[PDB]
């Protein structure tokens, strides 16, 4: 079954967020987690896996990947995987068996795909149609290496372009009032709200939690649409 599209006033309005949009922006800017062909070095609680990935900027960080249930964590525990996603640091707490903010320790949700058998020869393009106030003025594509790809990765790549080229998120507020990204595969679709919840704080953790289902799409099938409205 296919997720019905956003109802009247179901979408978060950026005008009702009064904190710094910077906190959303840094999730969809260049910094992100991407590791190829790694295996988890520890579990954490029931739903979580810890990975060691290269920092590049000293040597090794720990990423706490959190899924929405134990079946997901059990599945990938002992597999070689690719990890891709939006990571955070503030109020990122975990150990390998309320604590200081640690640059070598970061958190995310989902973003995990089997490595073996998932690699394409070529990078594949997936076209994105953007609607501003219902008009499709802008069309581009995002690229992936993966037969099976997390919606999270595609979401990240899409927004990253919109950040760079349409200023989707700025330091204080967005030029868009509402925004959702919609993924279509055959005649089945689902969408994410691109805007923070109302009020004066943005909880990065709570927002990213939507990726914890590890939702995947076929890169050969999927289409992407973005509906934005202006202020």
């Amino acid at each position, epitope marked *: 079954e296919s997720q019905p599209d956003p109802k009247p006033d179901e979408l978060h309005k950026s005008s009702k967020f009064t*904190g*710094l949009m910077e906190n959303m922006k*840094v*999730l969809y800017d260049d910094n992100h987690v991407s590791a190829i062909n790694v295996k988890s070095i520890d579990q954490f609680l029931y739903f979580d896996l810890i990975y060691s990935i290269k920092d590049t900027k000293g040597n090794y960080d720990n990423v706490r990947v959190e899924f929405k249930n134990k079946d997901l964590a059990d599945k990938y525990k002992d597999k070689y995987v690719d990890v891709f996603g939006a990571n955070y640091y503030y109020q990122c707490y975990f150990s390998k068996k309320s604590h200081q*903010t640690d640059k070598r320790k970061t958190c995310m949700y989902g973003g995990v795909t089997e490595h073996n058998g998932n690699q394409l020869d070529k990078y594949r393009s997936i076209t994105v149609r953007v609607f501003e106030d219902g008009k499709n003025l802008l069309s581009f594509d995002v690229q992936t290496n993966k037969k099976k790809v997390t919606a999270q990765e595609l979401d990240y790549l899409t927004r990253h372009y919109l950040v760079k080229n349409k200023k989707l998120y700025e*330091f*204080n507020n967005s030029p868009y009032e509402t925004g959702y990204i919609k993924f279509i595969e055959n005649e089945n679709s689902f969408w994410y709200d691109m805007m923070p919840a109302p009020g004066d704080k943005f909880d990065q953790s709570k927002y990213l939690m939507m990726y914890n289902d590890n939702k995947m799409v076929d890169s050969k099938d999927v289409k992407i649409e973005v509906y934005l409205t202006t202020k």
Partner: nanobody
């Protein structure tokens, strides 16, 4: 990692202006999210301005104060116009590392480094 030293505090008759400076050593200010706070006698420390976009300002100082950041002098500035008695306070510069992918805005308790501050006194 970053050490902050304020200067420029003094007394000013209402309606005049004043510019505060905060020099930084040990790290480039571009690596930190910089902010100005102030603490009037008989009140908590409160946010004045943060660096980013074209600057984000407390309502109380909107239109009167300007924050800026000179990267090559590794210095922050607070330009204060139309000073009023209410603006009397100890003024503080603060820094939070950008590598945490989080901006505390005016949550003073989150910031990692502070300057000693400077007295601004506005006589009516």
């Amino acid at each position: 990692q970053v050490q902050l030293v304020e200067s420029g505090g003094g007394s000013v008759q209402a309606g005049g202006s004043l510019r505060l400076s905060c020099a930084a050593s040990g790290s480039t200010v571009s690596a930190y999210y910089m902010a100005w706070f102030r603490q009037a006698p008989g009140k908590g420390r409160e946010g004045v301005a943060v660096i980013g976009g074209s600057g984000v300002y407390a309502d109380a100082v909107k239109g009167r104060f300007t924050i800026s950041q000179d990267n090559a002098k590794n210095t922050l500035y607070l330009q204060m116009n139309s000073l009023k008695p209410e603006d009397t306070a100890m003024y503080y510069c603060a820094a939070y590392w950008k590598g945490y992918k989080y901006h505390p805005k005016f949550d003073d308790s989150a910031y990692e480094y502070w300057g000693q501050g400077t007295q601004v006194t506005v006589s009516s």
